[PDB]
Amino acid sequence: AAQTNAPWGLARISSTSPGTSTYYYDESAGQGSCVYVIDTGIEASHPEFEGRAQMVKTYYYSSRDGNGHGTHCAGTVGSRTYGVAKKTQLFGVKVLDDNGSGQYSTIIAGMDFVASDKNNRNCPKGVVASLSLGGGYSSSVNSAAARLQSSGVMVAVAAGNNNADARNYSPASEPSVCTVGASDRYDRRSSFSNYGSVLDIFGPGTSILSTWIGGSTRSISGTSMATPHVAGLAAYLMTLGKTTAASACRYIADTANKGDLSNIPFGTVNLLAYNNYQA
């Protein structure tokens, strides 16, 4: 399939070259897979989600996304216009309040929720969890991310927007999950994107247009915005049978665009998420 005038990030994950605007992808589009978006919740009623998004858990008075961040990330995963896997199932776990804030303990409980809740969902193609969140280093947040990964969920976490080594941030520093840095439309590392040996991949992170609360859209920047690209890419690749949850991050890196990003610090992988679709 071909989505003309796609957001630049979608066109990039299906391109060996920057500066194109058509997203190419196999029409399976993540059908039969599931992506948990553990964030501020999802505006499931948004027409871009086509009934495929829903709230499955909240730790606050409402499951409604009053922030927009989780709606944006879900839109990049699987919204029809801005998503990578336009047919995947989107489950919202509201571990962040409408300020975008969350206690690490609520975040840990959300990861253990997904690790069990997937046994209540129909995901024959597999399960993805997109963690567009992060704070300082925590071995307990890291271990929850490892349990989630160990449980059979592909876990994609943001590297962080500190322009630092992601080694001092959780869950970005958990080596078993898929830690994602952010790039821009000119194949530069995003000026904010964390780096380091713990990173596994880079996704489009600067000026990403996706869904927003109130049925709207907007463009925002962050490693929280590169993470749903790889998360959506993983649900896409697992539906095609190219990889499993335990292997998808290592697979995505094997098939990524090599040595195409500039301003990548020594010791950080120079890999850009690439669906390797041939139309």
Swiss-Prot record:
**Disulfide bonds, paired cysteine numbers:** C34-C123, C178-C249
Any idea where the Peptidase S8 domain is? 7-279
Enzyme class of the recorded protein, top EC level: hydrolase
Query: What organism, scientifically named, is this protein from?
Result: Parengyodontium album (Tritirachium album)
| UniProt family annotation | Belongs to the peptidase S8 family.
Entry keywords, A to Z = Calcium, Disulfide bond, Hydrolase, Metal-binding, Protease, Serine protease, Signal, Zymogen
The active site is formed by: D39, H69, S224
According to UniProt, the name of this protein is Proteinase K
**Catalytic reactions of this protein:** Hydrolysis of keratin, and of other proteins with subtilisin-like specificity. Hydrolyzes peptide amides
Any one GO MF annotation of this record: serine-type endopeptidase activity
Tell me its cofactors.
Ca(2+)
Report the EC code(s) recorded for this entry.
3.4.21.64
Tell me the stretch of the parent sequence this chain holds: 106 to 384 of 384
- Chain positions recorded as Ca(2+) 1 binding sites: P175, V177, D200
